[PDB]
Amino acid sequence: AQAPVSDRAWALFRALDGKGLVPDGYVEGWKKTFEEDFSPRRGAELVARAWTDPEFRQLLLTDGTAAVAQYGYLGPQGEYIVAVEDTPTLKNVIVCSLCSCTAWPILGLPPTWYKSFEYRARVVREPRKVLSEMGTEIASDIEIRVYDTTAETRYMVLPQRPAGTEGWSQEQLQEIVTKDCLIGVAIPQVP
């Protein structure tokens, strides 16, 4: 038997706050960071830059941390970054089978589905079927590689740039790089 979760969560807050252990505006500040600053729009920016700037692409793939630092997007759960490059014969997908490990600052906090037991159990073993069920068909002539986020590396996928986007601006490209593209379960689509 358990008290409502809202009551338990606020009880934890109140117990700590009432002992002076929580600075003024502390949880409010974190809420703002989580809701407004940590965003897949940042990862999209990185991808769009890599797509249009061969030099930056090279930096992003060889020293992800330095590349992300240039944009000022290192942060909690995103201090050591590795970007993994999709190719015509390789599709990368990220999971945290043991919990929910995610590059928060550049992908945003993980969505419910990514933290689900279903995704955590299945994508490591049957990524092709999982992606297919989610709406992404990966042909058999393509290697699927699943990165399980088990330590401190925090990953982003650099997806392939779709045909039909030649000449687009970085802002235009950013729009088609979604959260799901950064996690690796979706391929960018030309609207």
Partner 1 sequence: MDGVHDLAGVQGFGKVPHTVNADIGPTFHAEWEHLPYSLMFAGVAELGAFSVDEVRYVVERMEPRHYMMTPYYERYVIGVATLMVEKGILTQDELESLAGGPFPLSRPSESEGRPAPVETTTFEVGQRVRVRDEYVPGHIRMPAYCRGRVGTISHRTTEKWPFPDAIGHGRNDAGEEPTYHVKFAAEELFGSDTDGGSVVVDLFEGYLEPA
The answer to whether 181 is annotated as binding is: no
Tell me whether residue 60 or residue 96 sits nearer to Fe ion (CB atom). 96
Q: Which of 7, 99, 116, 143 binds Fe ion (CB under 5 A)?
A: 99
181 is catalytic: no
137 binds partner 1 (CB under 8 A): no
The listed partner (Fe ion, partner 1, none) that binds 137, CB under 5 to 8 Å by sort, is none
Tell me whether residue 49 or residue 179 sits nearer to partner 1 (CB atom). 179
Question: What residues numbered 43-102 form the site for partner 1, per CB under 8 A?
Answer: 76, 80, 82, 90, 95, 97-100
The listed partner (Fe ion, partner 1, none) that binds 6, CB under 5 to 8 Å by sort, is partner 1
The listed partner (Fe ion, partner 1, none) that binds 10, CB under 5 to 8 Å by sort, is partner 1
Q: Which of 41, 71, 144, 170 binds partner 1 (CB under 8 A)?
A: 144
100 is catalytic: yes
Q: What are phi and psi of 39, to 5 degrees?
A: -160, 140
Tell me whether residue 63 or residue 71 sits nearer to partner 1 (CB atom). 63
DSSP 35: I
3-state secondary structure the chain: CCCCHHHHHHHHHHHHHCCCCCCCCHHHHHHHHHHHHCCHHHHHHHHHHHHHCHHHHHHHHHCHHHHHHHHCCCECCECCEEEEECECCEEEEEECCCCCCCCHHHHCCCCHHHHCHHHHHHCCCCHHHHHHHHCCCCCCCCEEEEEECCCCCEEEEECCCCCCCCCCCHHHHHHHCCHHHHHCCCCCCCC
Q: Which of 87, 125, 169, 171 binds partner 1 (CB under 8 A)?
A: 125
Which tokens in the block code for residue 69? 């630092």
127 binds partner 1 (CB under 8 A): yes
The listed partner (partner 1, Fe ion, none) that binds 58, CB under 5 to 8 Å by sort, is none
100 binds Fe ion (CB under 5 A): yes
Which tokens in the block code for residue 8? 């338990």
Question: Would you name the residues annotated as active-site residues?
Answer: 96, 99-101
